[PDB]
Structure formats: C-alpha cells, structure tokens
Design a protein around this nucleic acid. Structure first.
Ligand SMILES: [Mg+2]
Ligand SMILES: [Mg+2]
Ligand SMILES: [Mg+2]
Ligand SMILES: [Mg+2]
Ligand SMILES: [Mg+2]
Ligand SMILES: [Mg+2]
Ligand SMILES: [Mg+2]
Ligand SMILES: [Mg+2]
Ligand SMILES: [Mg+2]
Ligand SMILES: [Mg+2]
Ligand SMILES: [Mg+2]
Ligand SMILES: [Mg+2]
Ligand SMILES: [Mg+2]
Ligand SMILES: [Mg+2]
Ligand SMILES: [Mg+2]
Ligand SMILES: [Mg+2]
Ligand SMILES: [Mg+2]
Ligand SMILES: [Mg+2]
Ligand SMILES: [Mg+2]
Ligand SMILES: [Mg+2]
Ligand SMILES: [Mg+2]
Ligand SMILES: [Mg+2]
Ligand SMILES: [Mg+2]
Ligand SMILES: [Mg+2]
Ligand SMILES: [Mg+2]
Ligand SMILES: [Mg+2]
Ligand SMILES: [Mg+2]
Ligand SMILES: [Mg+2]
Ligand SMILES: [Mg+2]
Lengths: 137, 116, 208, 23, 96, 86, 66
RNA sequence: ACAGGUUUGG
RNA sequence: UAACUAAGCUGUAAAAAGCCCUAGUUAAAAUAAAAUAACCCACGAAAGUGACUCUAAUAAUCCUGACACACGAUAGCUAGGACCCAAACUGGGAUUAGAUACCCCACUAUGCCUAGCCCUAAACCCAAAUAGUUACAUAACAAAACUAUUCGCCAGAGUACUACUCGCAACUGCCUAAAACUCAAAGGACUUGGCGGUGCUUCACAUCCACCUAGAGGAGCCUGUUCUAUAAUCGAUAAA
RNA sequence: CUGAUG
C-alpha cells in the first residue's frame, strides 16, 4: 500500500483513476472562506462553472453567515447542485483563512461529494500592496 | 539548539547596537509556569459511529444489530476504568509528562545561582 | 450524616453467608470484614431479606412515591401488578394453545423487559462552547439509563392520561406496550436516538 | 515619574502652537 | 570557586585536581587543633547537611562521644540558643 | 498564478479520509509558518512594532529552550529518593 | 511538667543529638534507619547464602493494627 | 563650617 | 480590462451605511512594495540597509579636537511625472446625554520617481572619544565598579523646546536663548498597604455547570413594602 | 458593546 500525499503531477506516468477519469479531469470546488462569508463554486476541468452556492445565497444574514453551520449548509447546497449535474469526485481549493474553512469542506461530504484533493490556495502577498491599518488604536 | 546570545544585549563592552531588547532580565527562574488546564480528547467515537450506523440503516432499532451495541458499552466501560486508574498511575509515575507541581520541586532542589 | 466514615453498607443476602466453605476467595474478605471491627449501618426499613421483593421494584416505587406517603405508592404498585397479571391471564385464556406457549404471565418479567426496552443507549449533554450550548452525544452510565427509562414512563403515566383512567390501569397498558416496543416511551427513546444521530457530528466537543 | 515633566512640556508646547495659530 | 585557585593543583580535561601536599599539611594542622580541643574537654559538633552519609556521620559522633547535626539546620540555633535550646546552654567549642 | 496548478500546498486523501487530510494540510502550514503569517498580514504592522515583536519572540524562544534544556538535564534526578529518613 | 535536664553540671549535653532540636525524634529516626540498614544487610546475606526463612508481616488486615 | 531645620505613608 | 455563473458583495460583539458597472474562476498590462530564509547580526560615521544582476566603491602606516565644511529617518514645501494599495482632512453609518474619537464604507493631500529646499525625533543603547585594569569597592534600580589625555555641557522648580537678539532658499519655522514674578520645595529609586473596567491557577459536596426533588413568576386570600389621596407617625428599605 | 464626576 504505497500511498504518497503528493499530488499526481501530470508529468509522470502514474496510473491513478477516479470514476474512470484522470486527476486532470476531476472538477474543482473553489471555497473562498472569508472572515464574514464563505462562498463555494464548482467548476469543471475546463474552468466551466457548474454549481454556485454561498452562505449569502443560503438564506443567512450578516452575523448568521459567519458561523460554521452556514458554511456547512452552503456546502450541502453546493454538493446537491453539483450532484444534480452528475459529478462524482472533486478537488477542493481552499482560499483564505476563515471560520467556515473546515465546515465548508465537510459540507460537500455531508451533501454527497467525494473529496479527493484538498489544495490550500491562499493569497499570500510577498509584501506587495500595503494592507489596512491596525484596529483598537 | 539554543540561539546565540553574544552581542545581543546593551552593555558597556558591546560596541555595536544591541539586537535583543529583553522585557525582563533573562534569568532562568526556579519555578516553571503552570499548565493552563491541560485537557484531553473524547473516546469511543469510532465505536459510536458504527453503533449509529445500525440505527440509520435498520431504521433505529436495537434488535436488528447487537454487537455494535455491546462493543460500544465495552468501550465506554474501558474508558471509565482508564479515567480513574490512569488518573493515579500517571500522577504516581514520571515516565512521560509531569505536572508543574513536581517540576517546581525538581527545580528547587537544583536552583539557579544569580549571586556569588 | 449520623453514620461516620467507618460505617459500611449492610449485606442482606442470606445465601452469601449460608455457604462460607464453598469458596475461599469470598471467605478471605468475609473473615476480615468483622475482624477489622468495622461498624455497619442499620438495615433500611424498606429493604429486607424477602425473596419476593426486588430492588428494581423498590426503586420504581420510590420514584413513583409523592412526598412521604409510602403506603399509597405501595398500593398503587400492588394494583398495577394485579392488573397486569389479570390482563395477561385474560389474554392467555382468550388465546389458543399455540399462543399459550408464547404469551408470558410473569409481572416481574414483563416489567423488567419493559424497562430494558425503554432503557436508552446514548444521551445528549449541553456543552458551552463559543457562547452557545451544543447537544453533544455522550454515552451514559447504566444507572443513568435506567433512571431515565423509569422517569420517562412515570412522567408519561402521570401527565398523558385522563382523569377517569387510574395510574395502575394506565401503567398496566404502558408496560404491555413497552414489552412489545410500540409505546410512547419507545417513541421518545427513538426520538432521543435520532436527535443524537443528527448531532453526532459534534462528538469532537466532548473531553471525557 | 518622568512622564509628569514630559506631559508638562507637551502641554506647554501645545498651548504655544495654539497661540501661534490664533495670532 | 574563585578562592580555590591557590588550593588547586591543576585541571585534567575539565576536572580540577587538588594539591595533596598542602592537603596533608592543612590536615595535619586540623587534626592537631581537633585533638587539642578534645583533650581540653571541648564540645565538638560535627555539622554536615548531606543526605548520603548522614547515618555514617551520626555513628561516628556516637562512637566518639561528640555531637552531630545532619538534619535541617534551624535558623536561631546558635544565635538564639537561649530560646531554642534552653534557658542557659553551653555552645559547641568546635564545629567540624 | 504563473506556477503550475495543484502542486503547491496540496494534500491527497487516502480512502476518503477528509479530517485527517485536513489536519495534515493544516500542520504543514503551521510548521511552514503560513498560518501566523496570514494572521499577521491581515492588518499592517509598523516596523516599530515589528522589531519589538521579533525581539520578544527571540527572547521567548531563548528562555523556553533554556528551560527545556535544564528540564531534560535534571530529569535524571526524578527517581525515588534512596536516602529517605536520613 | 517539662523536659528533664539535658546537660550535667559540666554543661556537656547528655544525648548526642542535642544540637538537632529534637534529640528524641531524630534519635528515633537514626535508630530506625540503623535497624533498617541492619535488616537490609541481613537479608542480602541471606539471599547470597540462598536462605529465605522470613515472611511478610505487613498484611495486618485481621489484626486491625494502625 | 564640627554644623542644624526644611520635601515624603516612610 | 474580457468571458461563464449567482443575486448578492464588502462590512462588525450585534448592525447600519456603501456597492448591486456586484461577487467567484479563467487570462491581464502600468504603479507601489519587496513572504520563508532571519533561532542570521553583517555593512555604513550617523540616520539607514536584507527581491535579482552589472559598473563604481566603502578615507587616514589610523590620538582628542569646533560656532568651519559635509551628511542627516519619517513629516513639511516648490516644479514636473506616477497613482495598485493605505490614508491626514473631509462626507456618511454605528454607540453615547453629548462623540466633531476609538468601530464600518468612500475619498484627498501624502506615502512613489527626478530636480531644488526645509535640517526636526524617546536622532535612546538616555551610558562621549582615544588605550587599558579586575586592584579598593554593592545609596537604590538599571547594563558591575574603574583609570590617564581630552572635547561639549551641568548653579532649586515653575515661569521656559518662552519674548527680546544674530544667522539660515527656511516667513504659523529652525539654532542660540533669558528676565520680572510665585513657592520652599521641585526631583530619581526603594519598602508596605489600598486599588486595577490587565492577567493565570484553585476548589466549593445544595454548588457553578453535567444532573435529582419540591417551590415563587398563572388564580384568589393574608401580610409587608414603593406610589397616588388626606390634618394624620417613623426607622429598615442591594447581597446583609 | 457602553458607563461621567466627587
Ligand atoms: Mg524594560
Ligand atoms: Mg517576570
Ligand atoms: Mg505650562
Ligand atoms: Mg518628593
Ligand atoms: Mg443597506
Ligand atoms: Mg493603471
Ligand atoms: Mg520581497
Ligand atoms: Mg558600525
Ligand atoms: Mg577604512
Ligand atoms: Mg580628528
Ligand atoms: Mg493621489
Ligand atoms: Mg482605498
Ligand atoms: Mg465622519
Ligand atoms: Mg515627501
Ligand atoms: Mg531630512
Ligand atoms: Mg533612531
Ligand atoms: Mg540625552
Ligand atoms: Mg535594600
Ligand atoms: Mg567628542
Ligand atoms: Mg531657573
Ligand atoms: Mg523642538
Ligand atoms: Mg522658539
Ligand atoms: Mg442550587
Ligand atoms: Mg405550598
Ligand atoms: Mg401567584
Ligand atoms: Mg400584596
Ligand atoms: Mg412604616
Ligand atoms: Mg427612614
Ligand atoms: Mg437610618
């Protein structure tokens, strides 16, 4: 049982299949987890969006969509709208450190989606644009 | 390893600018800080999952599947016994970790000597 | 509080002493229990060495008793057992020879089986985390489960009956329903199990 | 401590600046 | 300790070595001063706080007829003696 | 952006285990220092505070390392006292 | 009543642990430790000579001795 | 200057 | 800036305001800045400097030494250019009795480059430079106590980083810098209480929760209070 | 979350 946590780079001759497809054909699920909202959007391998569901579109409100239950419901709805189009496996791309980070991830499994690759793509500026000032002066 | 300390503080013999600005004098105290309510994790989660699987599959009845009901109780009893026996075994022994109540008495036997 | 720390619990079982030679491991502790000059508390007025009484029946009568009127709860339990026995005898005499080999008539057995059927498995504990209370599913002890199973039945027979229906008459039907697992106590137990299964995702919040 | 005299000089300089702005 | 440089002979790879010549000279002087006190009926108290030979020191003091002290040394023992020991006591004439 | 996709900060699950893979990915970022870096870059800090934070962290690390070293050096003397009652 | 005379007319204390604060308690501790060392050496000699003629007198359950 | 009084809970 | 998807996005402890030419993904110049390495301590006289490469280059066969000469962070000024992002000011939305503040949104000067000024900092390592010592020696704390040659300062505190002068591309400025008057104090460290709307730990066997029993808040009555009403008691009137 | 004075 030789299992490597490294992703199956297309440059190699590895044979890893999910539902008959290769790792390059598996759809993507972008989960932008901000500090006040968690958006989930499902796109195909050709960068074509399939399903879109956010904590705001789930019927929540200002402080209600910041909790983890809102991200879990958003993930359930996204998984439902994705399975409505016939998808099996997905690659989760997490963006931003928010409270609904793991909730939106487990929401897809609770709504019926198989998570195979969790990629953390968080924007880390190499001292680029100057961010806002500090609070509690 | 331990980071270097030469040429860090502000002294008369140091010709460069001091690098480290200590809030308090870097003297090793004779008593460690008390651990902020060392906690533990739950138990028998995997045994409860396979137990509730019977309820979700057979429509919430215990007469259908039984071993998933007995192993759960066995895990609960073993956890209840380990919560009471280890709470004394680990406080009597010192193989692994130890509370600060003993670290303080261990350090006071061989304290630091700031003077002389 | 009048019993100091040196007072231990009594031992009412006569058979525990009627065979002291048949074993050595039990003799080893019984030969020192008195040689240590250990003081023993007084035998309770509700518990005796009678072979027809049961600690489960005693606990249920104590939980049913309101205030301090003990004879009222005793008579209620007697009437309940009598009604159960007579209804089972009626069902036995109104059945055929095939159902006679399956229908039981033991009131103690029916009561204990009903309690075992109504005994829950896992409960819910409110844990405060992040300023909110979450109902974490937690395994309960045997005494906790039995106490909940008895209290649910007692509360249902107290509040969910009619003024014309008596407590023994209502409990005689509740026990027969709990024996066949078709009663509101089993319904409440299944509701508890469903609410625990719906919250099992919060099991990582428990610390014991 | 020394913040007494520091704040004293601060208040004096602030009053001087306000006087300059007024006149 | 800084006051051991004149009483040390050298250092063999970190471990210091004591000069046994001066050791024996000081030991001769110490034993002479100890014998004279015991001859002149002097109270000799072996004070030594070390939990390895506390039994040996007490046995030596018992066999010598002199007094020993290897337990927790109290604060006002020798100073506040008229309150710790008794009304009027006789302090040890020699401490070892 | 210009680098290849699904290579940097990627963890492959095994047998559909999601929680363990997420904990592994999180430990990766904590050991690499990205979690604290993002939590610090959320709001801009001035160099007057940056130097102070660096000095504080250096002193804290030095003190913790010295305490751990002395604890590991004195752990031998934790055994039962063989000279009790002397 | 109070404590008896500790030192004679010459001033020399009678007991050998008078300068310890508890000339009775510390003497008892010393005698107990001496008997313990003697018993330890006796048991070691017995183990070396392959002789086990003693028993464990610690279980005082039927006696009730505290 | 052979000095003393005077700040402060001290 | 273009293409697909959705009616929502940002926003706080909670909201509102703002934007719905909005939001996510795929691509995308110009400008600003330069993650980890850094637990490193080097360079430079100091301020200062750590995204990469190239050219030039970092004085004194080496004492101290100005009011002379030359530099001198951010902030400010002038002219030209740039403007992603942050933001003085300003306009709104919260909270407060009030908030022209801390909280949220938009936006400007400004932060960015060249040329020319202004020459200020807790410019603090509050410890001057040059060659050394561990001798005597703890006011307190702090970075232990000191030698020989020097440079520049120090005469109670407030008045006072003030006015009057001189000089300065500076003109609400900078350097130098008093006096009248008021008081017998003004100051640094320390010891102990008190306090803290800054912290950490501890347990309560009717106690906080996990939990058990019986009660008040629903009806009437009694009784005691706070109120209206009279010429018509009073005290108590948070745990207590 | 906020709460002024003696
Ligand atoms: Mg400090
Ligand atoms: Mg401290
Ligand atoms: Mg003034
Ligand atoms: Mg004073
Ligand atoms: Mg609005
Ligand atoms: Mg542009
Ligand atoms: Mg950079
Ligand atoms: Mg230098
Ligand atoms: Mg040079
Ligand atoms: Mg020169
Ligand atoms: Mg602009
Ligand atoms: Mg902006
Ligand atoms: Mg405004
Ligand atoms: Mg500028
Ligand atoms: Mg400048
Ligand atoms: Mg500076
Ligand atoms: Mg200065
Ligand atoms: Mg002192
Ligand atoms: Mg000079
Ligand atoms: Mg003056
Ligand atoms: Mg100035
Ligand atoms: Mg001026
Ligand atoms: Mg209570
Ligand atoms: Mg009543
Ligand atoms: Mg009422
Ligand atoms: Mg009333
Ligand atoms: Mg009254
Ligand atoms: Mg009154
Ligand atoms: Mg009064």
């Amino acid at each position: 049982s030789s299992f490597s946590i490294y992703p199956p780079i297309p440059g190699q001759e590895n044979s890893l299949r999910w539902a008959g497809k290769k790792f390059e054909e598996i759809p993507i699920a972008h989960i932008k987890a901000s500090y006040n909202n968690t958006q989930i959007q499902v796109v195909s391998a050709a960068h074509q969006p399939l399903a879109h569901a956010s904590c705001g579109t789930e019927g929540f409100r200002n402080a209600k969509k910041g909790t983890g239950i809102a991200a879990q419901t958003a993930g359930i709805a996204a998984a439902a709208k994705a399975t409505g189009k016939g998808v099996t496996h997905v690659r989760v791309v997490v963006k931003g450190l928010g409270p609904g980070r793991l909730s939106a991830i487990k929401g897809l499994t609770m709504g019926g989606l198989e998570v195979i690759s969790i990629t953390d793509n968080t924007p880390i500026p190499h001292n680029g644009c100057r961010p806002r000032k500090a609070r509690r002066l | 390893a331990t980071p270097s300390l030469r040429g860090r503080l502000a002294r008369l013999g140091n010709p460069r600018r001091p690098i480290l600005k200590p809030n308090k004098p870097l003297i090793l105290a004779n008593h460690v800080g008390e651990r902020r309510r060392e906690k533990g994790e739950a138990t028998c989660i995997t045994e409860m999952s396979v137990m509730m699987a019977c309820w979700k599959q057979n429509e919430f009845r215990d007469e259908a599947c039984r071993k998933e009901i007995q192993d759960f109780f066995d895990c609960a009893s073993r956890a209840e016994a380990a919560r009471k026996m280890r709470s004394i075994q680990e406080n009597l022994g010192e193989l692994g970790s130890l509370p600060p109540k003993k670290l303080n008495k261990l350090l006071h036997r061989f304290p630091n000597k700031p003077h002389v | 509080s009048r019993y100091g720390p040196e007072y231990k619990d009594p031992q009412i079982d006569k058979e525990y002493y009627r065979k002291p030679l048949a074993e050595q491991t039990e003799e080893e502790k019984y030969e020192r229990d008195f040689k240590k000059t250990q003081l023993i508390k007084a035998a309770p007025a509700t518990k005796t060495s009678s072979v027809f009484e049961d600690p489960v029946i005693s606990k249920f009568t104590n939980m049913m008793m309101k205030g301090g009127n003990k004879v009222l709860a005793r008579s209620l339990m007697t009437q309940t057992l009598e009604a159960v026995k007579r209804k089972q005898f009626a069902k036995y005499h109104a059945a055929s020879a095939e159902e006679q080999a399956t229908i039981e008539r033991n009131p103690y057995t029916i009561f204990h089986q009903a309690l075992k059927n109504c005994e829950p498995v896992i409960g819910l504990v409110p844990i405060l985390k992040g300023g909110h209370f979450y109902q974490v599913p937690v395994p309960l002890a045997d005494r906790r489960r039995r106490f909940l199973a008895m209290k649910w039945m007692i509360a249902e027979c107290r509040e969910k009956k009619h003024r014309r229906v008596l407590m023994p008459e209502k409990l005689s039907q509740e026990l027969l329903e709990a024996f066949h697992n078709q009663g509101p106590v089993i319904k409440r137990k299944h509701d508890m199990h469903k609410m625990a299964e719906a919250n099992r995702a919060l099991a990582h919040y428990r610390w014991w | 401590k020394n913040i007494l005299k520091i704040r004293r000089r601060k208040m004096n300089h602030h009053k001087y600046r306000k006087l300059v702005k007024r006149t | 300790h800084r006051f051991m440089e004149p009483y040390l002979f050298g250092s063999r790879l970190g471990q210091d070595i004591i000069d046994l010549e001066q050791t024996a000279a000081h030991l001769q002087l110490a034993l002479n001063f100890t014998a004279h006190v015991a001859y002149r009926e002097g109270i000799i108290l072996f004070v030594s706080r070390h939990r390895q030979f506390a039994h040996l020191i007490e046995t030596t003091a018992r066999d010598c007829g002199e007094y020993a002290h290897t337990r927790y040394f109290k604060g006002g023992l020798l100073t506040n003696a008229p309150l710790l020991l008794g009304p009027g006591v006789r302090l040890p004439d020699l401490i070892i | 952006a210009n680098h290849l996709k699904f290579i940097a900060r990627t963890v492959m699950v095994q047998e559909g285990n999601v929680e363990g893979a997420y904990r592994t990915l999180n430990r990766i970022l904590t050991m690499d220092g990205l979690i604290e870096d993002i939590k610090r870059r959320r709001y801009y800090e001035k160099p007057c505070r940056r130097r102070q934070r660096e000095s504080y962290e250096t002193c804290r690390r030095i003190y913790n390392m010295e305490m751990a070293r002395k604890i590991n050096f004195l752990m031998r003397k934790n055994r039962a006292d063989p000279w009790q009652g002397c | 009543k109070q404590r008896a005379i500790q030192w004679g007319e010459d001033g020399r204390p009678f007991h050998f642990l008078f300068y310890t604060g508890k000339q009775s308690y510390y003497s008892l501790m010393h005698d107990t430790y001496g008997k313990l060392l003697d018993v330890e050496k006796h048991h070691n000699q017995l183990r070396a000579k392959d002789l086990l003629a003693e028993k464990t007198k610690i279980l005082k359950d039927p006696i009730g001795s505290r």
